[PDB]
Amino acid sequence: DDFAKLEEQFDAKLGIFALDTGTNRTVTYRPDERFAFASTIKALTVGVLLQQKSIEDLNQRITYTRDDLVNYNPITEKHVDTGMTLKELADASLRYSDNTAQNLILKQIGGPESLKKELRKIGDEVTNPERFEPELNEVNPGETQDTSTARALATSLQAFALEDKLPSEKRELLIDWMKRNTTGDALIRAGVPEGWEVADKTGAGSYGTRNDIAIIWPPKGDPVVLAVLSSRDKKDAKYDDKLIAEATKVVVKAL
Numbered sequence: 001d002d003f004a005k006l007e008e009q010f011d012a013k014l015g016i017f018a019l020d021t022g023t024n025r026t027v028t029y030r031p032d033e034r035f036a037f038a039s040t041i042k043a044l045t046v047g048v049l050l051q052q053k054s055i056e057d058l059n060q061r062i063t064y065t066r067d068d069l070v071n072y073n074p075i076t077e078k079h080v081d082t083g084m085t086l087k088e089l090a091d092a093s094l095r096y097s098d099n100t101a102q103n104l105i106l107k108q109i110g111g112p113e114s115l116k117k118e119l120r121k122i123g124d125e126v127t128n129p130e131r132f133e134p135e136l137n138e139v140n141p142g143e144t145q146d147t148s149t150a151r152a153l154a155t156s157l158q159a160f161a162l163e164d165k166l167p168s169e170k171r172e173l174l175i176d177w178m179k180r181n182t183t184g185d186a187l188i189r190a191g192v193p194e195g196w197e198v199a200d201k202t203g204a205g206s207y208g209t210r211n212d213i214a215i216i217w218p219p220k221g222d223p224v225v226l227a228v229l230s231s232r233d234k235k236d237a238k239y240d241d242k243l244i245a246e247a248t249k250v251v252v253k254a255l
Contacts, residue, residue, distance in 0.1 A: 001029075002250045002253075003016065003029040003247065003250060006243060006246055006247055006250070009243075010230075010240055010242070010243040010246075011232060011233075012208065012210075012230045012231065012232045012239070012240075012243055013030065013033070013035075013230060013231050013232070014029055014030060014228070014229070014230050014243070014247055015029070015030045015031065015033050015035050015149060015150035015227070015228070015229035015230065016028060016029040016030070016031060016150050016226075016227070016228055016229075016247060016251060017031040017149070017150035017151040017153075017154045017155075017225075017226070017227050018154070018224055018225065018226045018227075018251045018254075018255065019154060019158070019224065019225045019226075020221075020222065020224050020255055021158070021162060021222045021223050021224065021225060022221050022222025022223075023222075025255060027250075027251045027254045027255060028150075028151075029150075029247075030150070031149060031150045031151040032149045032150075032151055033149060033150075034144060034147040034148070034149055035147060035148070035149070035150075035205075035209060035211065035229040035230070035231050036136075036137060036139035036146055036147050036203075036205040036206065036207070036209045036231065037127065037129075037136075037146060037147060037148045037153060037203060037205075037211065037229075038136070038137055038203030038204055038205035038209050038211055039097045039099075039102070039133075039201065039202060039203040039204065039211075040148075040153055040201050040202070040203040040211045040212075040213045040227075041102075041115075041127075041129060041136065041146075041203070042093045042094055042097060042102050042201055043094065043157055043160075043174075043178065043201035043213065044115070044119065044127065044153075044156050044157065044160065045093070045102060045105055045106060045109070045115060046090050046093060046094055046105065046174060046177070047156070047157075047159070047160030047161075047165065047166065047174060048109050048114075048115055048118045048119075048160075049086070049090065049105050049108060049109055050160070050166050050170040050173065050174060051118065051160075051165065051166060051170075052108075052109055053086065053108070055169070055170075055173075057086065058085060058086040058087035058090065059085050059086070059087060060085060060086050061083045061084065061085050062083055062084055062085070062086060062089060062104055062108075063083040064076070064080065064083065064084075064100070064104060065080065066080055068100055068103065068104065069100050070099045070100050070103065070132075070133055070134055071099060071133070071134040072097065072098070072099045072133070072134065073098050073099055073100040073101070074092070074096045074098055075088075075091075075092035075096050075098045075101065076089070076092060076098050076100035076101050076104075077100070084101070084104075086105070086108065089101040089104050089105055090105065090177060091177055093105055094177040094178055094181060094201060095177060095180055095181050095182050095183070096182055096183065097183050097201075097202060099133035099134055100133075102132075102133050103132045103133055106132060111132075112129040112130050112131055112132070112136075115129045116128065116129050116130075119156060122156065122159050122160075122165055123155075123159070124148075124152050124155065124156045124159075125152075126148050126149050126151070126152035127147075127148035127152050127153065127156060128144050128145060128146060128147055128148065129146060130145045130146055131145070131146055137205045137206055137209075138206065139205060139206060139207070139209075140206075140207075140235075141207065141231075141233075149229075150227040150228070150229050151227070153211075153213050153227040153229070154213060154225045154226060154227035155225075157201075157213050157214075157215065157225060157227070158215070158225040160174060161174055161175055161178070161199070161215050161225075162215065162223060162225070175199050175215065178199035178200060178201060178214075178215070179197065179198065179199040181199070181200050181201065181202070183202045184198070184200040184201075184202045184212055184214075186241035186242070186244075186245060187200065187202055187210075187212040187228070187241055187244040187245060187248070188200050188212045188214045188216065188226060188228060188244065188245070188248045189245075190241070190242075190244075190245035190248070191244065191245040191246065191247065191248025191249045191251070191252065192216055192248060192252055193252065195218075195219040196216055196217060196218055196219065196252075197216065197217035198214055198215075198216050198217075199214055199215045199216075200212050200213065200214035201213055201214070204239065205231070206235055206236075207231045207232050207233070207234065207235055207237055208230075208231060208232035208234070208237030208238055208239040209229075209230065209231045209232075209239070210230045210231075210239035210240075210241065210243065210244060211227075211228065211229045211230065211244075212226075212227075212228050212244050212248075213226065213227045213228070214226050214227075224255065226248070226251060228244045228247050228248060228251070230243055230244065230247075
């Protein structure tokens with residue numbers, strides 16, 4: 001099949017789950033194989049924060065120091081002296097994959113164990129958050145720590161973004177941040193036709209893990225939930241975004 005050929009071409013393992021929410025048609029390929037989730041966890045983490053915080057709670061300014069700063073903080077590194085509101089942290093986390101912003105939000109919801117418990121409550125029995133950034137990326141093959149599957153990540157994203165896990169105004173906030181993501185241009189966005197709206201969160205991890213989860217909107221019809229996960233056999237492997245764009249093109253074709 002086309003996914004097998006992509007795996008061969010890019011020398012990577014692919015994990016795909018797509019659901020057309022209008023028809024219950026799926027496209028699956030290793031949908032239950034585990035991958036380090038990497039920064040895709042940022043979307044589910046804001047999902048849980050929105051469950052717990054009122055809109056006005058998000059105006060709370062969070063202070064942090066240079067000590068809180070980790071390996072990839074494009075926004076938070078620029079606001080040490082001044083702090084950032086929870087709303088600004090959510091924005092940075094989702095649109096820029098700001099790791100410090102993720103860590104600060106994670107603290108607000110009680111850390112990885114609380115995130116896990118909130119995901120279990122919504123019926124996600126698979127996603128296994130244990131760590132903060134960037135050490136949640138330290139995943140070796142065979143391990144389940146800080147991994148999920150294409151099916152579980154898509155379903156949990158669907159839960160927060162499309163279902164009653166959040167009320168409409170919070171669902172819309174989440175979606176708007178994700179629609180306005182800056183990091184996903186070469187991934188699912190590059191694999192959908194013109195006029196399809198995309199709300200995605202990317203991940204990049206060890207073993208050339210390269211992930212993108214999204215809600216995608218055909219010009220006309222119900223949203224499609226999509227998780228495209230990938231990983232490679234060498235720890236220091238580089239990813240190619242094109243794999244995810246091409247897998248998306250196969251998904252779009254099959255639907």
